[PDB]
């Protein structure tokens, strides 16, 4: 009973050394610390060499004493998978963190597995309509593809991932997994409560009719928890792909936080750091996680990952490494966002493998390439326009600057999830309407319309509606002079008649501060522990 129950050798932050006097646990095995305040799971990372394993803590190590009994579980971190996980919130180690009781486990799968083989792969390219103009036009999504949203802290990739949830995850009739990795806990509560409202998550005895399962490793978690919670969400998605055999939607908010968490951990593991500050194993840790997120021949996973860029730096090694793992990379720019254009999608930096005329049709492809040609030509003109003004341009250049400003504003779109703070109701723009409208603005059918008629509208019917409305108003600015409903006898009381209906409050004068406060008696001397573990005052010597 002593063997294969080892003891804590040294504790450095998220990283625990445990010495096992016989038959060491394997790498990736799960170990349980006995006597901690909470459940502390340690995942074995390395064998250090002297009957010592090197572990990663899945919770805080504050409170670990250097002899503590650590129990090997003989297997990796196994999380509950199945249809009974639908509608629940899980953490990194598969525990319910939504207070709905224990999780109905059809199976429990380890969170570490290999990627599917080369024979298992799927080469099928059908488009996924998102109802977003810039996404559907310029970098269209694949229905079994890895999709990345690249952004720089405040450019809108959580709002884009929520709009993609709202548009896609209702028509798509499968199950969803939301793996929240390293994001705000407030946003996890927001998504959970809005999914209970729209009936995607159902509580109580209706729980089996839920469509989404949430796995959360948010930014208050230690680095070991945020480094493995994406693997937990992957395991929940891979059960539905491999065993239920059906389509999954996996949304991962900030897969960068996985890399950042392993970079926090890797400093204390005794590794020589790679470029900018990262672990030497950035590409292989990221690739081992990303190659599990695929569609095989037996099921589909449509993946949407938000990717954070660290200082608006798209050449940082974590974004530059994760660019090669995606089928559609939607890059959000801060300069686009500062012009008020939302979604702040850089149209000359967002790519897809679907922008291919043999896949989307030559009409869509030619419109998209013509839109990109006009935008790139304006980008080449902007250095002249900023200095010499638009008065120095050619008439051909003035035409392409006007058309490119119109197609820059037309790529912006109101979102249904943004209407609670913008106030403008959102529009779902169909793909045929997107192609037709952008073709019309390309050919010069809508040069009659101003620039701001295109800003934050759905499709080209609404450009002409807004262009009639902006023009029509250009006159109507007055005749709110008299003939009011706000003179003194319309339905109005007097002001003192309004004062007496005020519910007077009683101000309590005592702050309620010592209601049930148990003040402990602080000592005016530092009380410490002597050699016998007994509480004594600090001895008066230096």
């Amino acid at each position: 009973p002593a063997i294969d129950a080892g003891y804590v050798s040294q504790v450095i932050g998220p990283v625990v050394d445990v010495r096992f006097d016989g038959e060491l646990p394997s790498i990736l095995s799960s170990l349980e610390v006995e006597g901690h305040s909470v459940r502390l799971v340690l995942e074995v990372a390395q064998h250090m060499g002297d009957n010592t394993v090197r572990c990663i803590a899945m919770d805080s190590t504050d409170g670990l004493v250097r002899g503590q009994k650590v129990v090997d579980t003989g297997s990796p971190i196994k999380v509950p998978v199945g249809r009974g996980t639908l509608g629940r919130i899980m953490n990194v180690i598969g525990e319910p963190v939504d207070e709905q009781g224990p999780i109905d486990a059809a199976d429990i799968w380890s969170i570490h597995r290999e990627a599917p083989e080369f024979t298992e792969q799927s080469t099928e390219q059908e488009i996924l309509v998102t109802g977003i103009k810039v996404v559907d036009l310029l970098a269209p999504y694949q229905r079994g593809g890895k999709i990345g949203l690249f952004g720089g802290a405040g450019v809108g990739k959580t709002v884009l991932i929520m709009e993609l949830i709202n548009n896609v995850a209702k028509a798509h009739g499968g199950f969803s997994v939301f793996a929240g990795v390293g994001e705000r806990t407030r946003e996890g509560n927001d998504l959970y409560r809005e999914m209970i409202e729209s009936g995607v998550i159902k509580l109580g005895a209706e729980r089996g009719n839920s469509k989404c399962t949430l796995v959360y490793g948010q930014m208050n978690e230690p680095p070991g928890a945020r480094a493995r919670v994406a693997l937990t969400g992957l395991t929940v998605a891979e059960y539905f792909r491999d065993i239920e055999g059906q389509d999954v939607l996996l949304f991962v908010d900030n897969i960068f936080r996985f890399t950042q968490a392993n970079s926090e951990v890797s400093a204390l593991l005794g590794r020589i750091p790679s470029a900018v500050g990262y672990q030497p194993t950035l590409a292989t840790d990221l690739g081992g996680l990303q190659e599990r997120i695929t569609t095989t021949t037996k099921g589909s996973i449509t993946s949407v990952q938000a990717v954070y860029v660290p200082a608006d730096d798209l050449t940082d090694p974590a974004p530059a490494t994760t660019f090669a793992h995606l089928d559609a990379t939607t890059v959000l720019s801060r300069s686009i966002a500062e012009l008020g254009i939302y979604p702040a999608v850089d149209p000359l930096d967002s790519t897809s493998r679907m922008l291919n005329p043999n896949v989307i049709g030559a009409e869509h492809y030619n419109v998209a390439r013509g839109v990109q040609k006009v935008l790139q030509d304006y980008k080449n003109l902007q250095d002249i326009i900023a200095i010499l003004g638009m008065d120095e341009l050619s008439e051909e250049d003035k035409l392409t600057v006007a058309r490119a400003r119109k197609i820059q504003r037309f790529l912006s779109q109101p979102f249904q999830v943004a209407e609670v703070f913008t106030g403008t109701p959102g529009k779902y723009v169909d793909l045929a309407d997107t192609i037709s409208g952008f073709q019309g603005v390309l050919t010069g059918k809508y040069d009659d319309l101003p620039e701001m008629a295109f800003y934050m509208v759905g499709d080209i019917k609404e450009v002409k509606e807004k262009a009639d409305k902006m023009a029509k108003d250009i006159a109507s600015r007055k005749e709110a002079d008299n003939k009011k409903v706000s003179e003194e006898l319309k339905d109005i009381p007097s002001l003192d008649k309004l004062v007496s209906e005020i519910k007077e409050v009683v101000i309590e004068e005592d702050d309620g501060l010592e209601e049930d406060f148990k003040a402990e008696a602080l000592s005016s001397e530092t009380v410490v522990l002597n050699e016998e573990g007994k509480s004594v005052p600090l001895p008066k010597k230096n």
């Binding site: 805080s60 806990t185 003179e487 005020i502 402990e520 522990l529 230096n542």
Partner: protein, 523 residues
Amino acid sequence: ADAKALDELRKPKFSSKYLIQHVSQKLIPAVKEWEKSYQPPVIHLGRVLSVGDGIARVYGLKSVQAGELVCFDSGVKGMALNLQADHVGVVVFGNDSVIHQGDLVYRTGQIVNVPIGPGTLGRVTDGLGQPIDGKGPLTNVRSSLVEVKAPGIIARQSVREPLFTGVKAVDALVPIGRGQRELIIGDRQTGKTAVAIDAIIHQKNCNEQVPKAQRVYCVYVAVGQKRSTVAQLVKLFTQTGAMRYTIMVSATASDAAPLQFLAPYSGCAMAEYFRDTGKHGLIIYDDLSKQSVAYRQMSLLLRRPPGREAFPGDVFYLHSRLLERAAKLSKELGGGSLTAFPVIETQAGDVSAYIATNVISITDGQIFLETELFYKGIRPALNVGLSVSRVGSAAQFPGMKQVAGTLKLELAQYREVAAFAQFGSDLDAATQYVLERGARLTEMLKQKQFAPIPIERQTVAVYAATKGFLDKVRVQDIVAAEEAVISQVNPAVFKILKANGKITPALDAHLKAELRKVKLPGA
């Protein structure tokens, strides 16, 4: 030398003991004649192996917890960061010039904790909870940990209550929810502190008009500031009366970098007392960009590998595990809240810095304060195109929400036509209208220091500006015009607007009536 071959040396294989017995009769008398030179051996206590750079290596301390307050025998506290096989690396909350090699380290049995409670309310403490205001020890207080984990998903609810700041720009444009986190990001000397000070003074003004549970108890955490600045701020909070509700934690620029790293966690543990017992807290981390610099100092002195700009790599986790404790709790947890105002100084307006973009992707919004608006005298210099608060929106004052959408739209069009014409020669005379209205409104929103306004006197003041009622006044006398409007309007309508929550159509009628008998100074 294999461990298979070092394991067989536990078994005795000497086959002759002619000097086991020779020294075992002679070892104790030779040890006894050197007892003047033996320091007493150490097992559960600690002895300092080596101290330097504010990190001591401590031999022994066999039963210390990781992350625990240790006490050096000179009375300086420490924190056991990394327990190693041979030593314990402790981090010294103080100057290491008083720790010697061979000093005794005492375990205290408790992870790093500060005094929290009703009795720390009013006091000025250091980064670890000991008072520095000189008025004695912290009484009516209890000890709680500084590295509590933030509440989870199920322990929260969305922010609903509207947390008035007293700044017209903030309460109209960037409104603050009560469990929200709002970054005050700007350059050096752009009025970052002034917004947070105005919020604390306004909570003093509102705490005496609300019934005992809608009161907000502020905490100001001053990290890396000067001590004279902190003394002047305590003088201001005392003479306004705001020190009745404020805790003031200060780890100043002279203090050790562990104390500056730890002081926001100490202040957060003190304000989480008010979050956890159903009350509401306000916490201001002034220059969280200095806590990041102190943590970078600690990490490079611990020889951890530097990352971007030199920062340790867990400098995101430093601020994320700090600001995630600013929450709004659910009704099963009491319903208390904690609103955070992190402050980040920016170099030359570079929002794309490391710590700046870290804290932007933690907080629920931003308040950008520009040097080009601050030099022109537009104070608070709030960048309206960049400032944002999405969690506090549709959770603000309802009358202010009825008025301020027109204000956000009119400042938006003012920004559009100033983005078109930065030189004045081509006047459309409808572009001149939106220029005159925008110049009226940006004179309306700018205000003076250390005098926050109640929300009904801001609602009426921006009601009188987003409508007509001020176009008689030209561009200069608007600061006196709004004071004349606040003065000459009959003060019953402020009581109806406060009590009802929004402008009712009877109140809109009386308000359109009352804004016509106002003697504007521009005439």
